[PDB]
């Protein structure tokens, strides 16, 4: 599966195309799916660190919970 990152995950701030591809390789496709992943699930990829992986989880979740506000 190409596992291409959705515009939401690719348009996520703090993440580059390379990081978006690695995260998408885990079946994740939309920024929301990325939030579903946990810091332990992000550790699966060495490119992502437990600290960087957690920062991406809250960032993605914040976009969904705070998505109502521009």
């Amino acid at each position: 599966g190409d596992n291409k990152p959705a515009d939401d995950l690719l348009n996520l701030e703090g993440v580059d195309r390379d990081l978006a591809f690695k995260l998408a390789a885990r079946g994740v496709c939309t920024l929301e799916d990325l939030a579903e992943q946990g810091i332990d699930d992000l550790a699966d990829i060495e490119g992502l660190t437990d600290e960087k992986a957690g920062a991406l989880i809250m960032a993605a979740r914040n976009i969904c919970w705070f998505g109502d506000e521009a």
Partner: protein, 81 residues
């Protein structure tokens, strides 16, 4: 002193995964859970979407995660002993 708070998050009938989430923050006694508000916890990645569900289950008992605030931890009930 609420016995659910004194009990170790590991004692939670839920799988260790539930306690592993909060425990990951250096928490061993559910009491610390009431010390921090769920919001402060939802602001951390250490928690997983599934972990949140387990919290709601225990929160249903209203015994822990009631948004309480403790100056230290041991309530007048525990007293010196």
């Amino acid at each position: 002193f609420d016995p659910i708070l004194l009990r170790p998050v590991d004692d939670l009938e839920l799988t260790v995964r539930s306690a592993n989430c909060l425990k990951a923050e250096a928490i061993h006694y559910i009491g610390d859970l009431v010390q921090r508000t769920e919001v402060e916890l939802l602001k951390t990645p250490n928690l997983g979407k599934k972990s949140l569900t387990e919290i709601k289950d225990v929160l249903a008992s209203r015994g822990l995660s009631l948004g309480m605030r403790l100056e230290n931890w041991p309530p007048a009930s525990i007293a010196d002993e």
